[PDB]
């Protein structure tokens, strides 16, 4: 009577699958089992992203998942984690969950159209900066964000929250990443009160 449903997750290490299965087993025990039975399909990260996209299509072909969870890779480069699943298992508009995605360029509902995250992005840490600033007797800020999407959006959020207080950022000094000669910007920031 309870129709079998598959909820899948890709996550590093073999051990993580054990509590994946344990947690999905615990979840159904909280409710009855005469209505729905919960299953799980798991896989582990691998370098070539094309292979991950192919395996994602093969899994959703073989599992017709209700929701897919995506993890971070243990091989640094903390940008290629939700590359394959965001747009491969997104053509059918199926919910996708990420746990550790502190990067914010995935929050725009114009490219992904299906993404839910359990960690706040860096614009919220900019809001935290504002809250710290609110009562500390500091009102003469100098932003030094880097020219990138991970920083430009934070700068825009910081600006739009500050203008609500009728205050302004004096400077928007902004240097490109990678280049290592940046001294004149500090001198520019030096010549102010």
């Amino acid at each position, epitope marked *: 009577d309870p129709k079998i449903v598959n909820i899948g997750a890709v996550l590093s290490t073999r051990k993580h699958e054990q509590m994946f299965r344990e947690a999905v087993n615990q979840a159904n025990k909280r409710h009855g*089992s*005469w209505k729905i039975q919960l299953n799980a399909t798991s896989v582990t990260h691998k370098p070539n992203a094309i292979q991950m996209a192919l395996s994602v299509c093969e899994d959703l072909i073989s599992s017709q998942v209700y929701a897919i969870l995506v993890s971070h890779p243990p091989t640094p480069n903390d940008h290629f984690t939700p590359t394959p699943v965001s747009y491969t298992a997104g053509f059918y508009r199926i919910p996708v969950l990420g746990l550790t995605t502190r990067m914010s360029i995935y929050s725009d509902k114009s490219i992904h159209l299906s993404f839910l995250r359990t960690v706040p992005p860096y614009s919220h840490q900019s809001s935290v900066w504002f809250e710290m600033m609110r009562v500390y007797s500091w009102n003469h800020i100098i932003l030094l964000v880097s020219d990138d999407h991970e920083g430009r959006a934070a700068q825009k959020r910081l600006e739009t929250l500050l203008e609500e207080r009728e205050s302004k950022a004096e400077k928007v000094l902004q240097f490109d990443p990678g280049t290592k000669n940046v001294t004149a910007l500090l001198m520019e920031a030096k010549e102010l009160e």
Partner: antibody, heavy 114, light 110 residues
Framework: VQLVQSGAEAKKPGESLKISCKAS????????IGWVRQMPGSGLEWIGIIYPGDSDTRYSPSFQGHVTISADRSTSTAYLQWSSLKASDTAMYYC????????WGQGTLVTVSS | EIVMTQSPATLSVSPGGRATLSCRASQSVSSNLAWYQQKPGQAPRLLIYGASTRATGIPVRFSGSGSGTEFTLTISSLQSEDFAVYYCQQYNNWPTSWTFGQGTKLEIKR
């Protein structure tokens, strides 16, 4: 789905028995198995519900501390053992399936007569 | 702490007639109630879960309804071959209560 219970039996007062309800229709850890009693002219009364996958058990308020509800991990049989205090509990016990008595067993007629 | 009650007494009915007996709820169970039509000399069969739906493999000659009101039988245009016993139980929260009724047995009219 299927359910087979222990055979009917009669025992003298002041003895402890055991009846094994074995499920061979679904996985042994997917549902909450239980126990109900149907004495002639009384109705249905719950005794105890146990999950064989973790041995978590609960019992009825008006029966607690009178019989044990054990289980296993490979034979997939739940043992409803009684105590010597039973003297007028002759009935036809049944084991539930998914806490809503989905698929009942064949029934175990337990008699306590002199 | 709310024992389900079945009514009215005995409701033996003629062939080609409905069977509607009351299971007036004393508590405020959210949506759960069941009757579990049973035949003496056999095991009770699953008739309704959630007091509004019907399990797979069963026709639609018996049902139920209600969320805050008294969950009642919804049997109509039935035959006389059943003549079964009808208890009524519910599970407001599980597994704690397991409240059961006494059963309004139905005979066969002629």
């Amino acid at each position: 789905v299927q359910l087979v219970q222990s055979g009917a039996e009669a025992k003298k007062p002041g003895e402890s028995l055991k009846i094994s309800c074995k499920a061979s229709g679904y996985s042994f850890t997917t549902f909450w198995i239980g126990w109900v009693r149907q004495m002639p002219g009384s109705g249905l009364e719950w005794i105890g519900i146990i999950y064989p996958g973790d041995s978590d058990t609960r019992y009825s308020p008006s029966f607690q501390g009178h019989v044990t509800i054990s289980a296993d991990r490979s034979t997939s049989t739940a043992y409803l053992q009684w105590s010597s205090l039973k003297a007028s509990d002759t009935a036809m016990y049944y084991c539930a399936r998914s806490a809503v008595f989905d698929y009942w067993g064949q029934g175990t007629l337990v008699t306590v007569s002199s | 702490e709310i024992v389900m009650t079945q009514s009215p007494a005995t409701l033996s009915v003629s062939p080609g007639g409905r069977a509607t007996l009351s299971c007036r709820a004393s508590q405020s169970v959210s949506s759960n109630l069941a009757w579990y039509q049973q035949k003496p000399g056999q095991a009770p069969r699953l008739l309704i879960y959630g007091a509004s739906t019907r399990a797979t493999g069963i026709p639609v000659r018996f049902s139920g309804s209600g969320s805050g009101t008294e969950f009642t039988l919804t049997i109509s245009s039935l035959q006389s071959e059943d003549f079964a016993v009808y208890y009524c139980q519910q599970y407001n929260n599980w597994p704690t209560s397991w409240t059961f009724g006494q059963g309004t047995k139905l005979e066969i009219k002629r």
